[PDB]
Each structure stands twice: as C-alpha cells, then as structure tokens.
Amino acid sequence: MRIDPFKLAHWMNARKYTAAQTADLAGLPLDDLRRLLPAAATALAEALSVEPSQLAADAHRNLTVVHKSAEEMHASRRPIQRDGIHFYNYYTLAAPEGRVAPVVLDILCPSDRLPALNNGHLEPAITVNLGPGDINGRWGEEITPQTWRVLHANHGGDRWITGDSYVEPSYCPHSYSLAGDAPARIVSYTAQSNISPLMTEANNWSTGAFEEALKALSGKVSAGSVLDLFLARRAHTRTSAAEAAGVPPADLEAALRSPASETGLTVLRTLGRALGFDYRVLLPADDQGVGKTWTTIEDSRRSRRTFGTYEAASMASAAHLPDLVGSFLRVDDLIDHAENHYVVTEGRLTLEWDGPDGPASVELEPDGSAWTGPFVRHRWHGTGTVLKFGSGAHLGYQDWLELTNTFEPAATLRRGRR
Amino acid sequence: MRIDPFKLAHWMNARKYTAAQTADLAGLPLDDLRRLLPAAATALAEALSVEPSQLAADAHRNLTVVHKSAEEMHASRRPIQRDGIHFYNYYTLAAPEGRVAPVVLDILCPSDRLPALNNGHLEPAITVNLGPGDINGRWGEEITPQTWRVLHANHGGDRWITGDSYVEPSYCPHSYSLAGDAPARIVSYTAQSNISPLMTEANNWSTGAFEEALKALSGKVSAGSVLDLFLARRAHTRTSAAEAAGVPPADLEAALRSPASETGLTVLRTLGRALGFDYRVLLPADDQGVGKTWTTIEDSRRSRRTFGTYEAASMASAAHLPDLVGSFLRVDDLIDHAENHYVVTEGRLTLEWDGPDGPASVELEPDGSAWTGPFVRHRWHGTGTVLKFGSGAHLGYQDWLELTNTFEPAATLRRGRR
C-alpha cells in the first residue's frame, strides 16, 4: 500500500514535472511528496496519468531469508482427489508470502492404476524422486516408452542423492503413480516462465496483430528469419544492410547458414554494430521430450564434486532453461546471483545468514525448508543433507544479456537506489 | 479494473486449486469464476494469497493505432522555465493513454547563454534536430569538444533528412541551446529501460544483498566473471565444470580469453549443454560518450535506400540498445515486431491500418503523429515525409533470446490466449 520512490520519480520525469508542479497538480503538500521521494496515492496516480499499481512499492522489502519448520510443512498437507481416489498429498515449502511455493507430493495412485493426467502448466519444473519407492512418470495418453518411464529412488548407500530427476516440459500434461508397493514422495520445483511477460502482453493485442505475430514465429526460427525482422524494423533490406556494414551479399548469406562459425560471427557482429542490434540473439540454441534432461541416480553420482565445505551432485538441467537449477548438497559461504529454495532431507542443520539485523540463524530438520533472496550471503552447518533449488528473473540470464550491454552497471544500480 | 483470465488461471494453478475450490475459498458463485476465466476481485486476491494488481487485466485491450492531430499536438504546449528564462516549450506526440509520450521541444535558450543541464534520466533516447536552426548540445559542466557540440539542421535540398541525430546516454545530464539566431525544434524519443525491472527489484533487496550484487557487477564484466557466477549457482568449480563437459581445463581458460572465436564458442556451448545454461550471454558485446552514436546529415544521406514503396534513411543507433530505433521515411505494407511512433514532417499523409473493425484510416499533417502496436499491419499514402521511431520490450531483443530457447513458441502463445 506504499509508494515506490523509484517509480514515482520515473513518472514525474516521464511527464517532465518538477516536484512542485506534481504536488500542485495532485493537490497535496510538497513536503509530503518530497518525503515520498493513502489519500496521496490516488491523487498522484491521476496527476501522473498512471494506474495506482504503477506507483505501488513491493509488498516485501528487505527480505533476506524465510524459513518453514518440518512441523509447519507437515501442517500444510492438502489431499488431492483425482479419478475417484485420493491421488496426491500436497505440501508447501518455504517461500515469501504471495510467491509460488515449492511443492512436495505424496504419490498415492497405486501401481495397478494408470495415473490420470493433469492439464499441464506453462512453467517448467525440475521433479526429483525423494523415495523410498520407485514411481511411474506419465507424459501422454497412450502408454509407450516415450510417455511412460520409472523415476527411480536410490535404494543404495549414498541416499543424499535421493533418486532420478528430470525437467517437466512447458505445458505438456503429466502425472505420477507408484511403481510398486513402496510409498514415495517427489519435490517438483517450478521456475518463473520467461515467456510469460510476452504472453501477458500478446493476450491484450488485437486478434489481427496476434495472428501476425504467430506467423512471424511459426516454423523454423532461424538467424535469417530473426535478422529479416531486425532489418524490416530498421527500414532495411538484406541488400541495403550488407552495404551499410560494408559486407558482400554473399558473405551475409554464408553467415546466416553458419552463424556460430567465427566468420559467421564476424559478419553478424559487424552488421550489428552498423545497424544497432545485438548479434548474440541471432546465434543458435540447441534444437528442441523427457529423455534429454533425464538424470539418473548414476548420473548424479558421477557428477559428485567438492564445492567449498560441501559435497555436491547435479539434478536435471536444460540449456534452454538457464534460470532453473537443482543440486544435492551434502553438509559435514554461499552466495547466488538469484533466489534459492532449500529443503532438508537429513540431519538437524543450521542455516546462517547476514541480514539487516546482523547475524541470524535457524535450525531445520528433514522437511524443514528455507528461501534466500538474490545475493544473500549464507552457509549451512551440521551433518548434513539439503536439496538446493534455484529460480528467479533477477538476475536471470536475460538480465545478464542486458548487463553486458550496460556502461558501468554498478553505478547505474547505485543511482537507482539513492 | 477487470480481471486477467490468464493471470487468474496462473495463480489457481500455482496454488493447485480447482475452479470449484477457488470459488468456494473466495465465497463467490462458481459460474462467475468460470466466466472470469468488482467485489469478486478482492475476495479472489485474498483466496489466492496475491495482491489485487497481480490479477489485474491491462487497462488497454485490443489497441491497434492511436493518433494525434497537429492541432492537438500544438494544444499540448507547456513552457519550461529554467535558469531564469523561458528555456523550452514541450509538446507531446501520440501515445496510448498512460504510456510515455514522445516529445518535441522548442529550443529557446539563446546562443549567448550556456544551457543549464538537467538531471539526466535512466532511459536512453534518440534526439534529432528538426531545424530549421543549428543547436548546441551540452553533456558536461565544463565546455570541451567532448561535452559541447553542434547538432546541425539540414540547410540543403533534401529536408526529409531534417538534421543530425545521436543517442542521449543513460543517466548523463544534458541540455540544448540555439547555435545562432535561427529557431529550432528537436524530437527526443525514449525507449523503455531494459535494466529497469532489475533495478526495481534490487531496490527492495536488503542493503547487504545489494552491496554483494554491486561487487559481483563491478569492474570488467567478462566471460570469466559471468561464467564463475553461473558455476557457483550450480555448485560447480571451474575444475568440476570442465570435467562434467569433458573439456580440458586449459581449453576452458583459452575459451574465456577468446569467447567469440568459433573454438571459444565450441567450448562454451559444450559447457552450456552439460551444465544447463545459455552460452550466448557469455559472448562479448562492444566495449562502452556522444561521438560513437553521432549521426550527421551526411551519414543519413549516405544511408538512403529503397524500402518497399518508401525511401528510408537512418538516424543514430547503438548496438547496446537493440530495442531503440529511428528512421527518416519518404512517402511518394509495414509491420514491425514491436511498437512504432510516427510524426509527420511534411505533407498531408494518410495512415491506414487493419484493426478489430476492419480497414481504418487517419489523415495527418506536419506535427500530426501516430502510434502502432506490435505487429499491427499498416501503410502510408500521400507525399510524403514521416519520422519513424521504435521502442518496446515486446518483442524486444531479450524476448528474442527466450523465443530461440522455446519449443514451438507459436503453439505456446496460442495456448496462453485461449
């Protein structure tokens, strides 16, 4: 219900109003406005021709760590009925109020019943089997090796690696059942969807414009197709663009068939400099169901390494999802460039952090969990297993792209805050 | 004041509530909720543990074109007093209600007075001299060739190219005065700041976390510095990462000194595939005051080309600002992947478009202006000069990065809308 001083200053500048003029237009005290840089908010919004939400400060300020005990986690249990049976139990892990919470599921569909599919969800997720039992994953109506596979639990001696993991692909329906008699739990961890802000906007476009967008995005989205959109944007043709960059038409065509060859790169960067765009977005990403990201217990075992005071093993990952991360951590300083979500699987562990009130700590037992904000310095003590998940748009890989395009990004951020 | 069905569905899924459960929790009719997919909004927000703004539909739906007559533009005139004199006149061009409007300025500070600097602004801008007179640009307290330069007007015969143009760099203070007796106007066109969403979030972090972020962003932001953050994020060291990718430690070091060599690229892409990140953000952007983007009348003349039915010439651009575009267009179909802002400089021109109610058109005289939404198909008729400006986060270059990382992006967008 508060006013963001950074958003307010933005809108005043956008309208080219001084503080005095703004207070005058809004009919409020100038000292009040200077301090801000409930009844004020509506007047300010109207004076600056914006919606109240456009001036609204975040509901959470100076968050560092949020935590949730095993007891609180167990208390959050909600049964899910599906296909005439008690199908899952659903529990939530630590997250800031209002944010999407990581989920633990009891898998209750028995081995002799095909698990009814959900509707899918936009956000991708890392799902890992916590065990103790093997489970079936289902990804299609018909039951084939492509749509039906066992997500194993670790039955052996290094249980800190709990089981198989994979990435649930965006939007595709899925479900789980027990592979046998033994019970099982999973963690499914969603990252923010990076295509969501585009879709939110595209949803409000006219149907005509939307159809035009889908045409431009249909088929193979290549260096050439994207470049042609960049050129049209700048009122250029391939002919005029190559001439502007001082590049032969044949060398441009060659670059577009091999963008990631350092000659292809040279041509595209030269064109980008001449025309005012970033060549990096023209470079190839890997061609795009569960087999690629699938990570076995063995895979994770093979990945084991020392990471400072910890031992670490990898869960599933995808190069097309750089913001979504998962690791097994054995405990016996941590700082990330975005958010972390942790859940204890073994031991009575202490999470320590430095926050606005100095050194702080919390003790967590299995099923206990925590969240850390971007760049919150922290560490774990005790002995010693926690699952480490990561998500967040800030700083996300798209932010990294922009930051490399920024002169003195630290100075820019400092200016924004004071 | 309406509810976005796409945001509502998102939050229900996030909480794992069915429609029936959601209506039940919110204490509203299930048919009402099914239709939505004022009194409902508050209850829904509370039930779904979100702020009302998080469910709010955009205030503008199905916008295609907005326009503003020369008369309406002239009527918007606002004087700006600075340093004891009438310093500018400020006019606004067509923009959707609430959005940042492009600005035209009368330059009124005389040649014998040094123009007092403003405070700067986060957003970069293309500024172009409309003439008829030359102007002084100022970019520093002391007057040096680096901080003081004439932005010329075209005095010759191809006036559709109106004058010199350049990019106002982010945050640096600037001002303008007349170079002589002749009066002058400029257009200054701002694009959205792509670092703004990061700063908005960073502003709400604890001071401790903020200081840690600035440390990680200080100095040279290189392939190696960014990679090391990516590795720490995944609980990897350079040693374990290279082993995971099956790459020799010496080949990784070599790649980080030459990321844009197709061997450097090969190593980084291999590491990105193995560890689950996008190598493209590790590749170099050009090293980063006014001299680089400065575009003379001659420059623009040299750039002239046929673009369909139009003749086009380039204004200033910057490779580190891919979303910000400007062109001179001579008139005697257009579709862009983001927003356009147009201002007529000569002739009585017709802008035609296809919108929700079929073919539409508007006639515009000099100073008349228009805005087009992303992918709105349009065309100009008549004879024949308009300035074409472009901005917008959607689809911006960061969206393009994500879209190349998406399986069947058109199918994803279609699903989001229905």
From Swiss-Prot, chains A, B:
Which annotated residues bind substrate?
K16, Y90, N118, E168, H174, S188
- The HTH cro/C1-type domain extends over 8-55, 226-282
Catalytic activity entry:
2-hydroxyethylphosphonate + O2 = hydroxymethylphosphonate + formate + H(+)
Pathway assignment: Secondary metabolite biosynthesis; bialaphos biosynthesis
Keyword Chaperone present in the record's keywords: the answer is no
Impact upon substituting R82A: Results in a much higher apparent KM for 2-hydroxyethylphosphonate. Caanot be saturated in (O2)
What's the domain of life for this entry? Bacteria
Q: Which residues bind DNA?
A: 19-37, 237-257
Free-text cofactor note: Binds 1 Fe(2+) ion per subunit.
Q: Which cofactor does it need?
A: Fe(2+)
Q: Which residues bind Fe cation?
A: H121, H174
For molecular function, the Gene Ontology terms on record are: DNA binding; ferrous iron binding; identical protein binding; oxidoreductase activity, acting on single donors with incorporation of molecular oxygen, incorporation of two atoms of oxygen; protein homodimerization activity
Q: Which Gene Ontology BP terms does the record give?
A: antibiotic biosynthetic process; organic phosphonate biosynthetic process; phosphinothricin biosynthetic process
**Which keywords does UniProt give here?**
Antibiotic biosynthesis, Dioxygenase, DNA-binding, Iron, Metal-binding, Oxidoreductase, Repeat
Give the EC number(s) under which this enzyme is classified. 1.13.11.72
Subunit record text: Homodimer.
Miscellaneous comment in the UniProt entry for this protein: Mediates the cleavage of the carbon-carbon bond of 2-hydroxyethylphosphonate (HEP) to produce hydroxymethylphosphonate (HMP) and formate without input of electrons or use of any organic cofactors. Reaction was initially supposed to follow a Criegee rearrangement with a phosphorus-based migrating group. However, it was laster shown that it is not the case.
Q: What does this protein do?
A: Non-heme-dependent dioxygenase that catalyzes the conversion of 2-hydroxyethylphosphonate (HEP) to hydroxymethylphosphonate (HMP) in the biosynthesis of phosphinothricin tripeptide (PTT), also known as bialaphos (BA), a natural-product antibiotic and potent herbicide. PTT contains the unusual amino acid phosphinothricin attached to 2 alanine residues. Synthetic phosphinothricin (glufosinate) is a key component of commercial herbicides.
* Family, as annotated: Belongs to the non-heme iron-dependent dioxygenase family.
**Protein name per the record:** 2-hydroxyethylphosphonate dioxygenase
Q: Which organism is it from?
A: Streptomyces viridochromogenes (strain DSM 40736 / JCM 4977 / BCRC 1201 / Tue 494)
